[PDB]
């Protein structure tokens, strides 16, 4: 500790890499809020969080929501829900509150009105983290008339702030 | 002084081991599909990359048979890994825990010998047990088919070090 700085730390009486830096497991139980063009709904999820090296992984499970717009946002509220000792500031990205287009992936959401769903290929990316809320952008792929949305399991990753 | 991997001697100085930064391997083995009453096997040649505390299984495109709406894909690492990489090297940092890690959307083309129709399935790492990595494939609906066209899929997860 006097001459070593995390993640460099004492490993069995030697200069090594801290096991907490290499792998860390946490959990989040909170609200996933969708905001589209005139559409708003909330869902509660229980997500696994993995912190590996300078990345953080939010492993969202499949959840079911309601109508979505062609263009919308997905918001994760980390001000509450993190399992101690993980804090809200631990989810802050390395680019802080910058607006980005990071981790852009294709997600298939099933839109339905209670019947058999029709799956649309939307575009998801990490856009911004501000005041403990991580905003994901969901747009593209078109839409149909629907009242319910079937969301797949989605893993959201981004660099983790260390300063 | 005393150094602990990945901290090692780099040209007479305290540095990061190049083996920790990048390591390349190969896997030739069986990928088995288990669905609701459906079972088939495929032989694959996969590239393996280990970067920092992650392992990347770069599976190429393979062709299989009927799949269920919900099913699993299993990679048997007990044999097939190119030495000196061992089966235990593929164990994740969460060991044999049941997880939903690296969930991605994969497009599989289902056909009965004709032009395939592509279904957007949901894939994630679920469990590694006794050298077998199990991937979950579900969602997106299905059609009547006899053959499945699988895309190239890269499966990544944290690698155990203790």
């Amino acid at each position, epitope marked *: 500790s006097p001459n070593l700085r995390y993640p460099i730390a004492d490993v069995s009486g030697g200069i090594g890499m801290s096991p907490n830096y290499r792998f860390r497991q946490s959990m989040w139980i909170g*609200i996933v809020s969708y905001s589209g063009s005139g559409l708003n709904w909330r869902v509660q999820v229980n997500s696994d969080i993995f912190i590996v090296d300078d990345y953080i992984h939010i492993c969202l499970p499949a959840f079911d929501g309601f109508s979505i717009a062609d263009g919308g946002d997905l918001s994760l509220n980390f001000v509450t829900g993190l399992l101690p000792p993980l804090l809200t500031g631990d989810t802050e990205p390395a680019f802080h509150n910058d607006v980005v287009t990071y981790g852009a992936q294709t997600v298939a959401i099933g839109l339905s009105s209670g019947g058999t769903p029709q799956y649309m290929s939307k575009n998801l990316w990490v856009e911004q983290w501000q005041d403990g809320v991580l905003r994901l952008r969901v747009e593209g792929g078109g839409s149909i008339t629907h009242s319910n949305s079937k969301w797949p399991a989605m893993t959201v990753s981004y660099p983790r702030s260390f300063t | 002084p005393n150094l602990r991997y990945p901290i090692a001697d780099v040209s007479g100085g305290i540095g990061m081991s190049p083996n920790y930064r990048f390591r390349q391997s190969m896997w030739i083995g069986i990928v088995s599909y288990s669905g*609701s009453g459906l079972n088939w096997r495929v032989q694959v040649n996969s590239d393996i990359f280990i970067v920092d505390d992650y392992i990347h299984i770069c599976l190429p495109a393979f062709d299989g048979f009927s799949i269920a709406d919900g099913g699993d894909l299993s990679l048997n690492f007990v044999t097939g890994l190119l030495p000196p990489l061992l089966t235990g090297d593929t164990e994740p940092a969460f060991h044999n825990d049941v997880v939903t890690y690296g969930a991605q959307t994969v497009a599989i083309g289902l056909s009965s010998g004709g032009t395939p129709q592509y279904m957007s399935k949901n894939l994630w790492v679920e*469990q590694w047990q006794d050298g077998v990595l199990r991937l979950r494939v579900e969602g997106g609906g299905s059609i009547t088919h006899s053959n499945s066209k699988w895309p190239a899929m890269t499966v990544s997860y944290p690698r155990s070090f203790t």
Partner: antibody
Amino acid sequence: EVQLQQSGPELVKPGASMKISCKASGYSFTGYTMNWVKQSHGKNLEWIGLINPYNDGPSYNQNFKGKATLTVDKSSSTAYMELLSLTSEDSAVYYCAIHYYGISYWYFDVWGAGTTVTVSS
Amino acid sequence: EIVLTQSPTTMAASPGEKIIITCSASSSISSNYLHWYQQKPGCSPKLLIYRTSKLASGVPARFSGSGSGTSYSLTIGTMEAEDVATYYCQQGSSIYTFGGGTKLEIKR
């Protein structure tokens, strides 16, 4: 610890309707889901329905559609299930269980004491 | 839709024995949606295992779960007299469903 309290035993005449109350206490967040499970003679567990605060509407099992109606009093933080047109086959123990920690993978991690409903003429 | 089937229906075993109850599903479900409950006589069911192999808060370590696809198994390593109960398996992939119960007895 989050606790769950149900109403007392009920003896109803055939064809009438009874109402059960389920009160939740000691919860750290409000987004938990209320469920109802019926255990008949023979110890058979059948899930009746669930209520989500953010869904604004109850979800019912097709076998219990029309037999039970679930409701919520968010001010008192209590759940209510009403069984209509009770029969001799409806005599059973009725539990309420919540998705407190099991909200994403749908396991009931908190159970009530249960309410035994007897239907006799 | 997804039917669960538990074997055996009843079971008698002396303390120290290793008990294995199996849960068989009609469809292939993710191991994240399979859970086990324990109900002691005169008591309400309690969560035993969630997401196949995760022990609930407070349950003894001798309990463990396992399985994938359509085959799941609850296992007590070394039975104790307290473990006399009826064990249920429940799936959460589709409409909620229980297994039907496995009753544990003492051999005498």
